[PDB]
Design a protein around this ligand. Structure first.
Ligand SMILES: O=C(NCCCCCn1ccc2cnccc21)c1cc(-c2ccc(F)cc2)cc(O)c1O
Ligand SMILES: [K+]
Ligand SMILES: [Mg+2]
Length: 213
């Protein structure tokens, strides 16, 4: 019995099926009252919602699904026909995420990609019929934000206006990614100061809009 299994069971027994909002509130209650977990959380989740609403992206790529908290948060705000691709290296987490999406009634909007980002990013065009991405949500290995950003550009997956949104730029922190995007003429950056999920600890999101090469 894992923490992720306990989160999924709590949602199933405390949220309303097909109600994404109740699923998010059930996750946040469980993680505030029982066991901390690396979901983006409500504080940064509110910033994510404001960003999703501004850009109304048609195709979103998420790197790191975990229990599906951020996939539910983003997918519930997507327009009819808009899609989310979420990459998850951990098969146990990928099965929790699918079950979370199923319970929330968002399964038709989200596709889980099983594997490592360095292996899956180059397959996006020919295997997943992707042209360019509207938005990218980075929430995987912190040391991969920079290489994956560079790999997405190499693969021709970024367009003028592609919104990159990165979690945990303060804690655990992504110093090379932050130094790179902020220093690059190919990105327009904005920092959104917030708090680490379920904790009185400063964290933040970085928005980096791709401007072309
Ligand atoms: O580590 C975090 N996330 C990444 C988890 C591993 C993802 C692995 N993975 C998934 C898809 C994928 C594809 N390719 C390659 C690798 C891939 C994380 C950690 C903290 C945290 C922890 C302790 C602490 F004291 C404070 C904060 C908080 C967060 O919000 C986090 O997100
Ligand atoms: K999450
Ligand atoms: Mg995170």
């Amino acid at each position: 019995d894992t923490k992720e299994q306990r989160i999924l069971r709590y949602v199933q027994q405390n949220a309303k099926p097909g109600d994404p909002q109740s699923v998010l509130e059930a996750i946040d209650t469980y993680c505030t009252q029982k066991e901390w977990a690396m979901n983006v959380g409500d504080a940064k989740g509110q910033i994510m919602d404001a960003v999703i609403r501004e850009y109304s992206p048609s195709l979103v790529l998420e790197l790191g699904a975990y229990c599906g908290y951020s996939a539910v948060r983003m997918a519930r705000l997507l327009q009819p026909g808009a899609r989310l691709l979420t990459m998850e290296m951990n098969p146990d987490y990928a099965a929790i995420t699918q079950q979370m999406l199923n319970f929330a009634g968002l399964q038709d909007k989200v596709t889980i990609l099983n594997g490592a980002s360095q292996d899956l990013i180059p397959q996006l065009k020919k295997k997943y019929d992707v042209d360019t991405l509207d938005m990218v949500f980075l929430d995987h290995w912190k040391d991969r934000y920079l290489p994956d950003t560079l790999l997405l550009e190499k693969c021709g997956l970024l367009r003028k206006g592609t919104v990159l949104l990165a979690d945990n730029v303060i804690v655990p922190g992504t110093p090379d990614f932050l130094a790179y995007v902020r220093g690059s003429s190919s990105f327009e950056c904005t920092h959104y100061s917030s708090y680490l999920e379920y904790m009185k600890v400063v964290d933040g999101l970085e928005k980096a809009i791709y401007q072309g090469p």
